Design an enzyme around this catalytic site. Structure first.
Site, PDB file in Angstrom:
ATOM      1  N   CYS A 188       0.941  -1.271   0.005  1.00  0.00           N
ATOM      2  CA  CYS A 188       0.065   0.066  -0.047  1.00  0.00           C
ATOM      3  C   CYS A 188       0.719   1.220   0.120  1.00  0.00           C
ATOM      4  O   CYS A 188       0.523   2.259  -0.709  1.00  0.00           O
ATOM      5  CB  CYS A 188      -1.036  -0.067   1.188  1.00  0.00           C
ATOM      6  N   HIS A 199       1.228   7.418   9.595  1.00  0.00           N
ATOM      7  CA  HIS A 199       0.335   6.163   9.276  1.00  0.00           C
ATOM      8  C   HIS A 199      -0.770   5.848  10.204  1.00  0.00           C
ATOM      9  O   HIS A 199      -0.430   6.043  11.434  1.00  0.00           O
ATOM     10  CB  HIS A 199       1.189   5.127   8.842  1.00  0.00           C
TER      11      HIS A 199
END
Ligand SMILES: [Mg+2]
Ligand SMILES: [Mg+2]
Lengths: 335, 335, 330, 330
Positions: free
Chosen positions: B152, B179
């Site tokens: 990702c 994140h």
């Protein structure tokens, strides 16, 4: 030879400064000044969401607080020129309201039966020395009236950047702070004073980019880095606790071991050193202004050129508070 | 000329890939394979904490699901060699269990009355091409058996880094990703498989430093950047939604306007461009693999030398999912 | 009182911490299958309960904690631990061996008493300190310190019963999320469809047992209480609401006064309008909050709402240590 | 049905969004004192309710939304807005003018009906759509769409009353934090010591009014209900628990069946074990959850617990739009 301190502005910083002062040998607070209902202020002093319960007992009394048996006068005067700090023997005032962050506004604390020295909890503008304790407090001689304790992020950045500079020489660098949300963000999406489209967003539900000033203003503390640093922030959903990353180019080639050794050699009561793989909750309530994390150091060599990343933690609340109290005590003792 | 897809591993990625496929013209899922109770899988397909309610209706039937009126076979076979993908006309398999992330483990889906192509949801090791759609899918000719849809973070980093390289030339760079927490972190402090002392900590209550691989491995997607990039992560308390910062040195002098213009010129269905001051919740569920944010660009010139910071958002869930589906459809159509 | 801890999880670690500040008690042995370096790191650093008060170092065969050595082993069967080598009288069984099969700790050079950190089954007494610890005579081998929710509910429900008489009641606990919930949506052992959901991003209904099991601690309330929970996104800190009918007519002031009269080291009383973060790390098993009391009177009938806070971690831990020390001394 | 919105806050913005998907309704004018560029950004991007479905551009004097122009003004006094210039029949008063002084919107070239997004006082009818909107005859000027919590509680409490008869009940709402709480500990307007606390880091008790005010919507329940709330760290999504005594003996199955029989567009019914994120953005005013029902029977006496979910944002907004459309048509 006891430092009697007055606090103007009993917000988060003023309350935490009061708490910290209870555990510092030669300092005490004899007067608080704030417009808020004393019952609200006493309640927030007793109970702090991130910094825990007050270490002792607080009672609202006529005209102030009884804190751990001792009386503390609490007044509610709007203007510094009307506060009779001398009535409580106050030598130095922590100006932490946010509304008098200049030398001509903050010097009003110094008047007949007022205080004699002032420390502002903000950069403070021109003609005001900016002091990060144990990084540049040697620029104080005692003649100053109003000084600045810098910002919370400056107190984290400064010893880390100074150690890079003193050991290796900094060419330039970009700061990224991964930062707890703060009181200038909305709890839910809505218009906020100033109209910033990102601080208008729910601060505990978002990663929020935000501008910074510490890196651009580092020259006030470390003159040889004036104009060499820039940066920005990402505000994230923790209520306190932050981390400052600096990516820089240096004048000397280095290795990770030498960068980490340079930081350890620079450690003191303000600048801590750790090799433990900690996370943000571990630095809530620490008394370091800055805690260098050796586990995050990167020295990237590509075709002979190096980029260096160094990372330091700070409790943007208590780290800054501890540094303010050090500067308050020192400034008061050198008159 | 309809792409019949099989999903092995109906976790978060497999479920979101199924959801995304419902809105893609030439693709459909005819078989799901997973060891979990189908009633658990159906419930998680219906209700997703971050990605919303399923767009339609899901019912548990004998041997599978009825989804928006159509039947989908759901089996629970442990080994890919025992799955009769061909019984449902499956041409290509999304291998998303995490346990068969190699070419000799994933090729087992290809056997008699099995599938004919495989896409793994992971880097995948040697002899496996790594494809970020609309960045390097031209390296596929059709002869491949097992390919990788990258990670990702790679799908966020790659088009941003490629645009820097193609326009200005990259010397080196350091990545910081801010994140969302993920499933490899503990919800409360405790031992976790692997023994990482930081993923052992409460992921929704901490800023947690963590290692990354996307920058170091970028060469699998952009060969001319092999070995030029490194990086790390700060995991923070949002349940999805992330942001990738890159600080780099370039071969040409640039300005902010030219960097931003280069990104806008590179925009497509995979790489978005925005000048809106958004926050992380705004990119939840987007179909871009990467959304460049022009408001965060920094070009810092100090004594003739430049450091360049570029920033792109991604929903580490749905951004990656959308890229996987593009690669699945394309790989299947070129046989 | 030398204590042995089997299972150095959250409860075990916090029990170790709490014991450092209680005189006449100390931990001389820890048994857990995890890497001691991971166990030492988690003892040093705790997300909700703060940094450890002192120093921890990994040594050969255990830890050095504040200068004192603590033995750390990884024996998988309670019959195999030689607790007496380290002077251990009583074992805190916290792994999650909740039968009277906790008595395997008790053998020749093992321990001589055991306290399970969970409901313990048929022939195991359930003790909430300062509510029913008088049922211990000293001859027991394996006892239970009840659940964290029970230690909150019990003194509040007992004070209602002793003063007014409870007919029936329903409990709602607004509870911190726990380690049995997923951090992100996914299958979890057991297959509960709600604990499968992201625990820090949801209000999550969940079943309880403390109200239904209250008879083990307060016999008069057997079968009188039921309830459920709403798990919400705070990492620790919880609150227990009880809506009850009573045998006497009451008022808010009378109920609050009864609660204040029942206060002790386990059951606290406050009139401060606090929030959940304010009870993180407290040593009360239960902190009654007088600001939340409701006595609703409609056509002569009353519904009575009483509310008590607890740190589902440290409140429960403090109660375990009290019961550990008391059980060891008798 | 052309609608005017005064107050483009969270409720106003969501009402604008919801109206884009309901036929026969459209917003032709917005009045708010905020910078239109800030208002447009917040309409486009919403933390909990997602990106706006379509396009929004700031133009001279208003917005262009999905091709259609919407007038945006900043008049500070309702008497000064010429609502009729834009064909506005009904005004959604959402600034927070909650008296029958909302009738200043109604004048010569102004609107001809007004709906306040709050309890409206003495001579203002309080409407929860599909619970009591039959009390409207069409002659009313200013009405109230009640509160968000009332729109959740009302159909659930009405179904209990219609089927079984309510004696009394106590409400506990486990509620998302709201804009009247501080993001970090500090003084807040009004001086409530609990809303002064960090709303996304605490369980925060807070007072309610919906249960005490239920008589405005269901006369038979006047003075029969009371309650309170626990604010918890989710940004939207809430759940209402009601513990009640009834005039008939019941069972869980019977209560759940009564709830299913009362279901409609406003009052939903589910047997799925959902969590709070699953109701974000729903259009039910109230979603009854049969999995949480308790019927506790002790010595012939019963406590009955019924639980309904609501998105305190979008559930309430959908109810306002229903009442807006219906009021405008009669
Ligand atoms: Mg603490
Ligand atoms: Mg959504």
């Amino acid at each position: 030879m006891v430092v009697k301190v007055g606090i103007n502005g009993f917000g988060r910083i003023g309350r935490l400064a009061f708490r910290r002062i209870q555990n510092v040998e030669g300092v005490e607070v004899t007067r608080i000044n704030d417009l808020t209902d004393p019952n609200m202020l006493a309640h927030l002093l007793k109970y702090d969401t991130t910094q825990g319960r007050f270490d002792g007992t607080v009672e609202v009394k006529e005209g102030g607080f009884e804190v751990n048996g001792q009386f503390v006068k609490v007044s509610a005067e709007r203007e510094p020129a009307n506060i009779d700090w001398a009535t409580d023997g106050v030598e130095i005032v922590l100006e932490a309201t946010g509304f008098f962050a200049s030398k001509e506004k903050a010097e009003q604390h110094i008047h007949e039966n007022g205080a004699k020295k002032v420390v502002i909890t903000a950069p403070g503008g021109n003609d005001v020395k900016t002091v990060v304790f144990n990084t540049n407090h040697d620029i104080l001689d005692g003649t100053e009236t109003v000084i600045s304790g810098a910002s919370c992020t400056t107190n984290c950045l400064a010893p880390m950047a100074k150690a890079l500079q003193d050991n290796f020489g900094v060419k330039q660098g970009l700061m990224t702070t991964i930062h707890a949300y703060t009181g200038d963000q909305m709890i839910l999406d809505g218009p906020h004073r100033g109209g910033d489209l990102r601080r208008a967003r729910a601060g505990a539900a978002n990663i929020v980019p935000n501008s910074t000033g510490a890196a651009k203003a580092i020259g006030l503390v470390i003159p040889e880095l004036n104009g060499k640093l820039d940066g920005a922030a990402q505000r994230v959903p923790v209520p306190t606790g932050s981390v400052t990353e600096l990516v820089a180019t240096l004048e000397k080639d280095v290795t990770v071991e030498e960068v980490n050794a340079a930081m350890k050699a620079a450690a003191n009561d303000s600048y801590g050193y750790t090799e433990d793989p900690i996370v943000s909750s571990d630095i809530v309530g620490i008394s370091y202004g800055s805690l260098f994390d050796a586990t995050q150091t990167i020295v990237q060599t590509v075709d002979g050129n190096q980029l260096v990343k160094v990372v330091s933690w700070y409790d943007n609340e208590m780290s800054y508070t501890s540094q303010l109290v050090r500067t308050l005590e020192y400034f008061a003792k050198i008159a």
